[PDB]
Amino acid sequence: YDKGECGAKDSGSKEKTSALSLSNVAGVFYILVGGLGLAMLVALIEFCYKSR
Amino acid sequence: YDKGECGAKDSGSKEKTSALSLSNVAGVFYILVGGLGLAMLVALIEFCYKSRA
Amino acid sequence: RGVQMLLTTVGAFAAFSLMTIAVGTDYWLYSRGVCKEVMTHSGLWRTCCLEGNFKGLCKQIDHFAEYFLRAVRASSIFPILSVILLFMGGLCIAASEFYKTRHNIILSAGIFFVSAGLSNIIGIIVYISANAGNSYSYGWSFYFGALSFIIAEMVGVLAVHMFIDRHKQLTG
Amino acid sequence: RGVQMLLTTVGAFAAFSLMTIAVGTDYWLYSRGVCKEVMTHSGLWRTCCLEGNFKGLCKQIDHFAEYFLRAVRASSIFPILSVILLFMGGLCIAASEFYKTRHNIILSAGIFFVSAGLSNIIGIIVYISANAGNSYSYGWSFYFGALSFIIAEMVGVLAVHMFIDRHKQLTG
Amino acid sequence: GISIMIKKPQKSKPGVFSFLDPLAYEIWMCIVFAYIGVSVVLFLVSRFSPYSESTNEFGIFNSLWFSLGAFMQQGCDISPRSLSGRIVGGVWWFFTLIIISSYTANLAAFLTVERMVSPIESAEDLSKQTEIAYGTLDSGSTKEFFRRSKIAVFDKMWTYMRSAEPSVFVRTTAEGVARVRKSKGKYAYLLESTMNEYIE
Amino acid sequence: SESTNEFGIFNSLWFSLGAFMQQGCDISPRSLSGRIVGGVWWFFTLIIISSYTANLAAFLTVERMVSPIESAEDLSKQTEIAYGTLDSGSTKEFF
Ligand SMILES: N[C@@H](CCC(=O)O)C(=O)O
Ligand SMILES: N[C@@H](CCC(=O)O)C(=O)O
């Protein structure tokens, strides 16, 4: 007990936050670009339907 | 008593209360003013085009 | 009809007078200090003492990246330029008794009036930021500045409206 | 008016050159590292050490459920795709010097440029998502790639503006 | 009376753009490219022939103007006619909807952690805190007093003063003060309050 | 030819106010300098509002009454709170 040390058990010192990384939101960008990629395809298939 | 030479302390009003200071958001106002500052020149070049059609 | 020329020139005159008074008066701030603690009032140039034996004493202000921002407050360039540009606009529109038919006076004075007003927004922001760099409250010059700005924001619209109508009537 | 061909012919080769240079240079990142820590520079493929006695020593990069994601970074196939598609886009207008009056040879150039840009964007996102896992900072290739994307966009847009004009004038 | 002494906590001068601090540099950069791409795609798809390009207002510049106001959630004056364009709109709308919320949440958290800082007060909890070290003068009466007094909190103080090394002890007021001045935040000192009242 | 658009001064004040609130504005600048001016004011409000809501959220999470005074100097600056020793107690003679 005289050799006890690690009061970090109780969070004896307080962390401080930092900004969100890109990884914490990366998902939305894939969704966006995939959506745009799909969005182009309709115009070509519409024009080929309207090709006659 | 002559030798003591520092004493600035929060009195009359206090920084610690809670509110955001003006300084904490100041830059946005610079961005705003610069934005409005730009739009004058666009109209001026629109005149400099049209003024000799 | 017409007399709006008088109203707009009066507005410019009044704002100019208020602005030059504001730059020229020791009534920006009340605070505690000593003209080397006592209630103390500030000009933008000088620190002056009241409420004590040194009442009426004055001293030059202590002027001393944000390293380069220090010069912005220290020069107070934006206040001065606001006055200079309001002077330019007013003295230009004062010339409109002659040299007529071109109407360039009205448009240019309009732009001068607006830019002069805009300048004081920066000046105020700069000063209010720098002074934080307690117990305060603002002196009358701060409100003379605000009022000058308000009148500057008014007068230019009316002057541009006069320019527009007096030019547009060529359509009929 | 007509001349836009002379302009739109310009940018694609420059964007291609910049993109391949960016892929082709070992200066994407400044970081701590090793070449078997000390300050180090790296590209996509390999690492070379500076700031010490070993300066000039090099090694190939460490290549090593979400597990299957690693392949995309390890290849970096998206950059390569964007480069190849940009080549195809440029070859569209090179082809449209012959076989004129078809018009529809022009159309795909912008589509190729757009898609290459979208690839570049994904490539960047992937690269950051991998590498961010220490006072780091970016090497010039990163900016060259960004600029390449921006030009590819603008050139594609104005090429489409030409394809809008040149066929429409036949249709009355 | 004896007193504790500490360094001033350094004043938290704002940064000129600290409002950005929630969101990290790379995210702020990468938003821009997406805004461009969306605008360009909206342009291209709007003016490809409906079967003739005169049939809609969605020129390049109007396409750049739609996306900015849409990103602000300010609404807009015009709306894309084709189903393909509507896809793009919906996507960009969802994208902004996530970002603005995340930004607000993070900023609120950042302020929240601050308030409950709870800085060292009365400092008797130096008998309970252990991350922050404190010194005492050699041979000074205090060096006997903490051996010679035996109140439980001072018992554990003396146990700390016994056990901690590099030692809590110092030969002179001058270099003890220097130790506090250099060992900012992490270090503290015990001295006579009359001396603190002279120094501070 | 002037006034080819709705944007009289009155309508300009109306539009800019509706733009500040995130509220329905039908008219459009349709033109470069106006569109430029429209943008930044939107970003300005976005940041302002987000800041306000965040800070109020923090404000409600932790409370602190703040003691009104701490020192004999404050007791020399006294507003109204009266004070005194025990009577007959030797601290009175000491004072
Ligand atoms: N001068 C004090 C020193 C007190 C101390 O540092 O313990 C004494 O008489 O012991
Ligand atoms: N204990 C004090 C009385 C209380 C006081 O002085 O206020 C005395 O011995 O006189």
Curated annotation (Swiss-Prot), chain A:
The chain crosses the membrane at residues 25-45. A lipid is attached at residue 48 (S-palmitoyl cysteine). It is found in: Cell membrane; Postsynaptic cell membrane; Postsynaptic density membrane. Induction: Down-regulated in the pyramidal cell layer of CA1 in the hippocampus by global ischemia. Palmitoylated. Depalmitoylated upon L-glutamate stimulation. In contrast, Cys-48 palmitoylation does not affect cell surface expression but regulates stimulation-dependent endocytosis. Ubiquitinated by RNF167, leading to its degradation. Detected in forebrain. Detected in dendrites of neuronal cells. Expressed in the pyramidal cell layers of CA1 and CA3 and in the granule cell layer of the dentate gyrus. Homotetramer or heterotetramer of pore-forming glutamate receptor subunits. Tetramers may be formed by the dimerization of dimers. May interact with MPP4. Forms a ternary complex with GRIP1 and CSPG4. Interacts with ATAD1 in an ATP-dependent manner. ATAD1-catalyzed ATP hydrolysis disrupts binding to ATAD1 and to GRIP1 and leads to AMPAR complex disassembly. Interacts with GRIP2. Interacts with GRIP1. Interacts with NSF via its C-terminus. Interacts with CACNG2, PICK1 and GRIP2. Interacts with GRIA1 and SYNDIG1. Part of a complex containing GRIA2, NSF and NAPA and/or NAPB. Belongs to the glutamate-gated ion channel (TC 1.A.10.1) family. GRIA2 subfamily. Ionotropic glutamate receptor that functions as a ligand-gated cation channel, gated by L-glutamate and glutamatergic agonists such as alpha-amino-3-hydroxy-5-methyl-4-isoxazolepropionic acid (AMPA), quisqualic acid, and kainic acid. L-glutamate acts as an excitatory neurotransmitter at many synapses in the central nervous system and plays an important role in fast excitatory synaptic transmission. This is Glutamate receptor 2. The gene is Gria2.
Swiss-Prot record, chains C, D:
It is found in: Membrane; Synapse, Synaptosome. GO terms for cellular component: AMPA glutamate receptor complex; cell surface; cerebellar mossy fiber; glutamatergic synapse; hippocampal mossy fiber to CA3 synapse; postsynaptic density membrane; Schaffer collateral - CA1 synapse; somatodendritic compartment. This is Voltage-dependent calcium channel gamma-2 subunit. GO terms for biological process: eye blink reflex; membrane depolarization; membrane hyperpolarization; nervous system process; neuromuscular junction development; neurotransmitter receptor localization to postsynaptic specialization membrane; positive regulation of protein localization to basolateral plasma membrane; postsynaptic neurotransmitter receptor diffusion trapping. Brain. Keywords: Calcium, Calcium channel, Calcium transport, Glycoprotein, Ion channel, Ion transport, Membrane, Phosphoprotein, Synapse, Synaptosome, Transmembrane, Transmembrane helix, Transport, Voltage-gated channel. The L-type calcium channel is composed of five subunits: alpha-1, alpha-2/delta, beta and gamma. Interacts with the PDZ domains of DLG4/PSD-95 and DLG1/SAP97. May interact with GOPC. Acts as an auxiliary subunit for AMPA-selective glutamate receptors (AMPARs). Found in a complex with GRIA1, GRIA2, GRIA3, GRIA4, CNIH2, CNIH3, CACNG3, CACNG4, CACNG5, CACNG7 and CACNG8. Interacts with GRIA1 and GRIA2. Interacts with MPP2. GO terms for molecular function: ionotropic glutamate receptor binding; voltage-gated calcium channel activity. The chain holds residues 6 to 208 of 323 of the full protein. It is linked to Defects in Cacng2 cause the stargazer (stg) phenotype. Stg mice have spike-wave seizures characteristic of absence epilepsy, with accompanying defects in the cerebellum and inner ear. The chain crosses the membrane at residues 5-25, 75-95, 105-125, 144-164. It is a multi-pass membrane protein. It comes from Mus musculus (Mouse). Its main location: membrane.
UniProtKB/Swiss-Prot annotation, chain E:
A lipid is attached at residue 76 (S-palmitoyl cysteine). Coiled coil: none annotated. Induction: Down-regulated in the pyramidal cell layer of CA1 in the hippocampus by global ischemia. The modification Phosphoserine is found at residues 149, 183. The record marks 147 as: Interaction with the cone snail toxin Con-ikot-ikot. Belongs to the glutamate-gated ion channel (TC 1.A.10.1) family. GRIA2 subfamily. Ionotropic glutamate receptor that functions as a ligand-gated cation channel, gated by L-glutamate and glutamatergic agonists such as alpha-amino-3-hydroxy-5-methyl-4-isoxazolepropionic acid (AMPA), quisqualic acid, and kainic acid. L-glutamate acts as an excitatory neurotransmitter at many synapses in the central nervous system and plays an important role in fast excitatory synaptic transmission. This is Glutamate receptor 2. It comes from Rattus norvegicus. The gene is Gria2. The chain holds residues 520 to 734 of 883 of the full protein.
